[PDB]
Amino acid sequence: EMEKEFEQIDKSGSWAAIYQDIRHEASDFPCRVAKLPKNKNRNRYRDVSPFDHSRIKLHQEDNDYINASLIKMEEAQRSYILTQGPLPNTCGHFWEMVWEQKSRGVVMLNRVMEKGSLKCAQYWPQKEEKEMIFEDTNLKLTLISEDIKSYYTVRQLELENLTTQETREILHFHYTTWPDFGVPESPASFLNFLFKVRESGSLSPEHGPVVVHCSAGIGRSGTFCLADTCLLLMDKRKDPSSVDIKKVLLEMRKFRMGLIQTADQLRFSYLAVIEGAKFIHED
Ligand SMILES: Cc1ccc2nc(C(F)(F)F)cc(N3CCNCC3)c2c1
Numbered sequence: 001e002m003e004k005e006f007e008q009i010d011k012s013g014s015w016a017a018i019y020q021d022i023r024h025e026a027s028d029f030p031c032r033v034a035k036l037p038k039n040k041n042r043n044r045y046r047d048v049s050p051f052d053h054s055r056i057k058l059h060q061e062d063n064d065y066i067n068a069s070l071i072k073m074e075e076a077q078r079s080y081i082l083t084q085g086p087l088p089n090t091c092g093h094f095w096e097m098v099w100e101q102k103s104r105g106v107v108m109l110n111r112v113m114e115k116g117s118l119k120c121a122q123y124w125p126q127k128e129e130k131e132m133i134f135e136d137t138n139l140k141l142t143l144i145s146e147d148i149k150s151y152y153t154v155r156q157l158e159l160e161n162l163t164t165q166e167t168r169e170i171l172h173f174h175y176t177t178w179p180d181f182g183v184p185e186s187p188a189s190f191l192n193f194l195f196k197v198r199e200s201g202s203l204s205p206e207h208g209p210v211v212v213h214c215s216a217g218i219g220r221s222g223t224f225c226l227a228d229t230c231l232l233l234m235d236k237r238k239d240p241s242s243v244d245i246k247k248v249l250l251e252m253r254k255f256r257m258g259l260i261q262t263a264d265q266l267r268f269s270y271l272a273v274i275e276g277a278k279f280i281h282e283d
């Protein structure tokens with residue numbers, strides 16, 4: 001079915017109309033903590049905030065606030081943490097969250113710089129011999145190795161809690177080739193990247209939730225979790241054509257606002273689910 005709906009929407013040029021519908025219908029819940037005066041320098045964008053009911057709380061009190069949300073999908077039996085790209089003053093909070101929530105993987109869907117503007121802090125070490133220390137949260141981070149490919153990079157990191165000298169292996173999955181403008185023409189590399197994350201075991205119930213981000217933590221990040229979930233649901237259910245991608249996206253929007261930011265991103269998500277279901281000189 002999904003193939004044939006996609007065909008009609010493309011023919012009618014109705015992606016923008018469907019997208020405005022999703023926006024009109026979405027949930028609204030309060031975000032009072034995000035809006036406190038003391039939290040102004042913890043938010044990259046004033047119009048992207050976590051709902052109170054689903055925000056992640058830091059355990060090192062004094063201030064428990066981080067721009068991050070728990071997306072808990074009940075039928076699919078998978079959880080994710082969606083967060084903004086860390087700021088220069090929130091990298092310590094980011095790693096504190098990964099530690100406290102027992103995450104095994106971090107998924108990054110942007111480059112630090114795009115279009116000559118900073119989108120995310122350099123929150124991980126680029127060289128084995130030059131480790132990072134976060135003095136405010138008492139954490140050390142070391143690059144162990146990396147595997148660089150044409151469309152994405154996988155890094156092995158070691159995260160140490162200095163208060164206890166406990167260490168843990170964290171996998172960093174970095175999609176390095178999403179366009180400055182628009183979306184990928186083909187979802188093939190996006191699909192190979194998802195399979196890599198799945199195959200690592202980073203998504204399994206034995207771990208804490210995977211941490212997923214882009215710059216705001218709602219657009220590209222939304223496409224990742226929406227596609228993962230719908231593909232889980234295509235497998236679990238007896239007719240995969242029962243899976244309503246609009247309905248799934250509305251359910252996820254109960255836990256974080258804004259997920260999928262453009263009509264182009266909504267079409268790509270459809271596209272990625274249609275293609276992933278099949279496995280289960282101008283310049
Ligand atoms: C046999 C098999 C089973 C499940 C798979 N799932 C995906 C998916 F995108 F992770 F869902 C991608 C998959 N492939 C991996 C190999 N290249 C194309 C994408 C895949 C392959």
Ligand SMILES: Cc1ccc2nc(C(F)(F)F)cc(N3CCNCC3)c2c1
Nearest residue numbers: 009010011013015016185263264265267
């Ligand atoms: C045949 C067709 C029909 C409708 C389309 N609509 C969009 C839109 F941006 F999602 F509105 C993007 C579309 N794509 C984006 C990716 N490159 C081809 C144009 C599109 C393509």
